[PDB]
Amino acid sequence: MQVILLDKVANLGSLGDQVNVKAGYARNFLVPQGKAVPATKKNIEFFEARRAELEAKLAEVLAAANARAEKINALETVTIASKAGDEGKLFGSIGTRDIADAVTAAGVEVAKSEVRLPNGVLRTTGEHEVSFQVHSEVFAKVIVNVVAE
RNA sequence: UAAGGUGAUAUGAACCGUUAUAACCGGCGAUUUCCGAAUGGGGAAACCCAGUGUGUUUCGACACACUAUCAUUAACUGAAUCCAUAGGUUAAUGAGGCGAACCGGGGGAACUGAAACAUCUAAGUACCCCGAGGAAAAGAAAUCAACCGAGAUUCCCCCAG
RNA sequence: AGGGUGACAGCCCCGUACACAAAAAUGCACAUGCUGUGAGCUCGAUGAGUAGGGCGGGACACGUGGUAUCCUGUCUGAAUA
RNA sequence: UUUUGUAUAAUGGGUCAGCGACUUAUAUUCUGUAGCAAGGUUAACCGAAUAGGGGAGCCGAAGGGAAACCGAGUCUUAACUGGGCGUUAAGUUGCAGGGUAUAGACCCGAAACCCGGUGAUCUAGCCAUGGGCAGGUUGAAGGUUGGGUAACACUAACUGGAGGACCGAACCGACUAAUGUUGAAAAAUUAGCGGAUGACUUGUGGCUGGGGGUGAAAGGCCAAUCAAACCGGGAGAUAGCU
RNA sequence: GUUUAUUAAAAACACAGCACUGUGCAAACACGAAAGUGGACGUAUACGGUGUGACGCCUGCCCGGUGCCGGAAGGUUAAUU
RNA sequence: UGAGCCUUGAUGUGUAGGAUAGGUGGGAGGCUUUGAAGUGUGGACGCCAGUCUGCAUGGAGCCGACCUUGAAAUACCACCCUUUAAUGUUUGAUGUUCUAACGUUGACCCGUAAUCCGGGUUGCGGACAGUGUCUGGUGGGUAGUUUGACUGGGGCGGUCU
RNA sequence: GCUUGACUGCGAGCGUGACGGCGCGAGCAGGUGCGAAAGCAGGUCAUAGUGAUCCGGUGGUUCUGAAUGGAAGGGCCAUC
Ligand SMILES: [Mg+2]
Ligand SMILES: [Mg+2]
Ligand SMILES: [Mg+2]
Ligand SMILES: [Mg+2]
Ligand SMILES: [Mg+2]
Ligand SMILES: [Mg+2]
Ligand SMILES: [Mg+2]
Ligand SMILES: [Mg+2]
Ligand SMILES: [Mg+2]
Ligand SMILES: [Mg+2]
Ligand SMILES: [Mg+2]
Ligand SMILES: [Mg+2]
Ligand SMILES: [Mg+2]
Ligand SMILES: [Mg+2]
Ligand SMILES: [Mg+2]
Ligand SMILES: [Mg+2]
Ligand SMILES: [Mg+2]
Ligand SMILES: [Mg+2]
Ligand SMILES: [Mg+2]
Ligand SMILES: [Mg+2]
Ligand SMILES: [Mg+2]
Ligand SMILES: [Mg+2]
Ligand SMILES: [Mg+2]
Ligand SMILES: [Mg+2]
Ligand SMILES: [Mg+2]
Ligand SMILES: [Mg+2]
Ligand SMILES: [Mg+2]
Ligand SMILES: [Mg+2]
Ligand SMILES: [Mg+2]
Ligand SMILES: [Mg+2]
Ligand SMILES: [Mg+2]
Ligand SMILES: [Mg+2]
Ligand SMILES: [Mg+2]
Ligand SMILES: [Mg+2]
Ligand SMILES: [Mg+2]
Ligand SMILES: [Mg+2]
Ligand SMILES: [Mg+2]
Ligand SMILES: [Mg+2]
Ligand SMILES: [Mg+2]
Ligand SMILES: [Mg+2]
C-alpha cells in the first residue's frame, strides 16, 4: 500500500516520502493514528497540496517582493525645516501628528477623511496640506481673501 | 324492462303491483357484524382485556374515532462523552396476506437405466425457498463468420441424431 | 344455428339472420389541454480489485481431455485506441 | 394355468351382472397399395385456411478410400498375374399394415430408495405443578437415667421411631394355571401371584421428531404400525419373476 | 428395583462399590452449518466416557500383534515455490 | 542466522623484472595544508614475498618513458571478465519485545427500571488464537455399494482358458 | 559347413467356427540365403505355449490440421 506520510515515522520517512508499506501497517496503525494517508495520485496532490499549493504561493511573492524595493532611491530629497542649530538639538516639527494650513487651494471637491498628516501644525508661516470638506476622494480648492478694514 | 311479483326444497299465510318507485335486469353509490394479513394488547380462529382523545337537555354510564410491525423520509427530542453519534417520541408515504399455471433466481434428491456398481444416467427433473409480471426472461455484439460477408434478443422448421 | 312445446315443427313458443339501443361507469385506440422528463448541433469522455492468472469447483452437447469460451469460492492482478 | 407330464389330492375361480389388459406419439425398416418418376416430396410459415403459395431442406440418381484425394472406378502395394469394395439393378412421397427404437409402452403386483410435511392426546425419557398410599408389625441411630471409666470407651433398662425394612387392602404391576382363541375383549376373564414411603405411583400441562428421538438396553417404545413412524409426493420406481 | 405394551421377568439390564481414562473451565463431552444451549449458575473430594458389579480373600505372566501415550534424530512425504 | 542488489571500495606472481603485468580507448605527470614520506600497530588476505586497510604521531614527499618486456604502469579517467568485502534495501528462518488488527464466556459506564446485544472506558491475551480457501493425514462416526458361476439341493471342497 | 526365408507386399482356392475369429495354402511381384544344379526356404515333425475392445505410450508417415500459415490433437503403418 503506497502511503504518503503526514508526519515523521521513525524507520520509514519524513513528512512526505511515498513508501511501500504493508497494508496492515497502514490500515490499522498509520491511517487511524494519523501518520499517513494512502497515495491515490490525488492525495499525492491533495495533501501534497501542502507540497504543491503552499509552495506555489511563494514563487510569485518572491517576484512581487522585487518590485517593492524598486521605488527606494527615487525621491531621496525632502524639504526638511528643523535646523540642526548649535550642535543638533530636536525642538522642531517634522513627524507623525498634524500639518494643515496653507495649500488648501488644491483641486476639486474633497472631505476631511483623506489627509495624511505629520507633526508640524504650521505656527511657522508656510504652505502645507489641507482637505476641504464635502466629497469623498477628489482634491479641493476654495480660496478666499479677507479684505481688511 | 314490465303485467305480473314477494330466491329454492315448498306449499300456504299475509301482502305488493297491473301504464309506472310491484318484482325482474344493468351502471353508479350506500350499508357492509365477528374471525382471518388481522394491524390497540392478548388468545384454545370467529373470544378475552385495554389505553388515549372527542362528544353526549338524567351523570348509572353510552356513542364514534384512533392506537400493530417493518422500511423510507422528515421534524422534535436525546446517552455513555465536548461536539457528536447511537437511542427515543411524533407525523407522512409505502409494504404486509392470498392466489391455478406460466416466468426468473437461490438451493437440490433418489428410485431408475447402465441388464451388478462407484464415473456416468435419471436431472438441474421432483421437491423446498425468494421474487416478479401480464407475461416474465433475454436483448442492441468486447457476436458470428472466414478474407466473401452477416448485423440485438426471443420463438417455430431445418441443419442433425 | 339451436332449444322447447302431450310422438319428429322453417311457418305454436323462445330464438336465429338482419337491423336498432345507453342515463351511468369503464377499457383499447386517435386528436388535443395541463403538469413532468429534455430533442438537434460542437469539442470531449468511453465502466479496475476489473480483464487475465494460480488453486478449487460449477456451466458450456463437450465427463480435464491436447480443451478454447463463460461463472466465481480462494489468493492475486494488467493494459487504458 | 403351469408343465416332460395333471381327474389329479398342483394353481385359480362361490355365482351373476357390469368394468378389466399389445395402446398412443414420434422416428426407423420391410410388405402391400396409390400417386409421380431420374426424379420424388415439401417443413415451419403465409393464406386467397383441407386449396394455393413456400423446395429451406430431406431421400434418390456413384462409388472407393482412415483421409487427402481419385472417380465407373477406387483402395491396397514400389507395382499387381492380382485381390477387396463398387460399377451391368428406380427411386420417392402418401395411405394401410408387420417389426424395431424412445417414451409407463400389454395389464396388474413388490419389498424398498429419495424429497417435503404431520404426529409424544398411546408409549419412552425428562421438566413444572398438584394428588395418592386402609390397617397392622419390626424397633436402627440418637436421647435420658442408673451403673462403670482418671476420663473416653463399654454396659442394662426406659425412651426414640430409622428403613429402596416386614405382613397386608387401595394403588401400581403381571409369575402360574385354566377359560377364551369367528373372544364379552385385535391381549381380556377367573382363581391364585409380586411390589405396596419408594429407584414408588398418579392427575393436569409442557419438551424431545424419523437415521431422528427416547431407551435401568428388550432393537424396546415413538397413536392397535418400528432393524428406521405416518401422510402426501418423485411414482405408472424397478420386477430377466408369478 | 428394571425389561421384550401384545408368546421370553430371567442367570439379562440397572445398582451401590471398584478401576482405567479423559477433562484447568470459553473444561472435556454432547445438540447445533451457526448463534448459542446443556455440562453447570457446577470447577478435579468436580464432570464426561469406558469396563467391572454388594461384601470377603484376591486379581498372576505376556507390550511381539492392534490401539492409545510419549519421543523426535534421521528416512519417506502434500499444497506451495 | 540465509540469499539478492544500483553504486562505489577492494580480488589478478608462465618467465623477461627495481616486483602481486586481465584488457581497449583516453594521455603526458595525478595525489599531498577538508593533509605527504620515513615508523609503531588493530583486524584480514597470503604463493610468506608483501599487498589491502583502520588508527595515532608525523609535516613538505610517494609515484612514468625507465635498462628490460608478446602487454608498460593504480600517473588522473572510462567500460568490464575472474575474485570476494558493505550497507540502504530486497525477500528466508527461529526467538525476544512491542501494539494497532483480531480475541476476551474479566471489570466498570451508557443505551436501559435488561446476566441478550451494541457502543464506550479499562485491563488481560495478542499477530498467536480463531475463521475462509487450498492441502497431506486420520476417519464404519456416517453414507453408497460389492461380495461370481458350475454344482445329482445349497455350502464346504474342487473346477473355470 | 555356409547362412537369416523366424523376408516385405499380396494371394487362386480351401478347411474350421453362430460370430469375433483361427487354420492350410500353390502361385505373383520385390529383394535374399543355401546348392554345381534340379530345387528348397514366408520359422521350428505337427497338434498347447494364450487375452477381444477401450484408454493411452513409443517410433514412422506434411493423411487431416476448426480464419490463414504452422502446431497441438486426431487418423494411417509399425509396435508396447
Ligand atoms: Mg395480534
Ligand atoms: Mg386486535
Ligand atoms: Mg442398475
Ligand atoms: Mg452423475
Ligand atoms: Mg468487413
Ligand atoms: Mg475473457
Ligand atoms: Mg479455474
Ligand atoms: Mg475447458
Ligand atoms: Mg414338475
Ligand atoms: Mg389323465
Ligand atoms: Mg377331490
Ligand atoms: Mg399347494
Ligand atoms: Mg385341482
Ligand atoms: Mg380357490
Ligand atoms: Mg362377467
Ligand atoms: Mg442405487
Ligand atoms: Mg427422507
Ligand atoms: Mg423435511
Ligand atoms: Mg415406564
Ligand atoms: Mg418395603
Ligand atoms: Mg375385571
Ligand atoms: Mg388377578
Ligand atoms: Mg406387601
Ligand atoms: Mg437381539
Ligand atoms: Mg404401537
Ligand atoms: Mg424402510
Ligand atoms: Mg408434492
Ligand atoms: Mg408398479
Ligand atoms: Mg425383585
Ligand atoms: Mg411379552
Ligand atoms: Mg410373561
Ligand atoms: Mg457384567
Ligand atoms: Mg489382570
Ligand atoms: Mg507416535
Ligand atoms: Mg456400511
Ligand atoms: Mg449357484
Ligand atoms: Mg514339437
Ligand atoms: Mg489453422
Ligand atoms: Mg483457430
Ligand atoms: Mg499422430
Protein described:
The PDB classes it as ribosome. By secondary structure, the chain is an alpha+beta fold. It is 17% helix and 6% strand. It has a domain at 69-148: Ribosomal Protein L9, domain 2, CATH 3.10.430. It has a 3-stranded antiparallel beta sheet, with no helix packed on it. The protein is elongated, with a radius of gyration of 32 Å. The protein starts with a strand and ends in an 85-residue tail after the last helix.
Quick structural overview:
The PDB classes it as ribosome. The protein has 149 residues and is of the alpha+beta class.
Write the layout of secondary structure elements.
Blueprint: E1 2-5, E2 19-20, H1 23-30, E3 36-38, H2 43-46, H3 49-56, H4 59-64
Antiparallel strand pairs: 1-2, 1-3
This protein binds magnesium ion (MG) (40 copies).
It binds 6 RNA strands through α1.
Proportion of residues in β-strands = 5-15%
Helix content: 10-25%
Small-molecule binders here are: magnesium ion
**Which structural class fits the helix and strand makeup?**
alpha+beta
PDB class: ribosome
Keywords: Cfr-modified 50S subunit, ribosome
Entry title: Cfr-modified 50S subunit from Escherichia coli
Name: 50S ribosomal protein L9
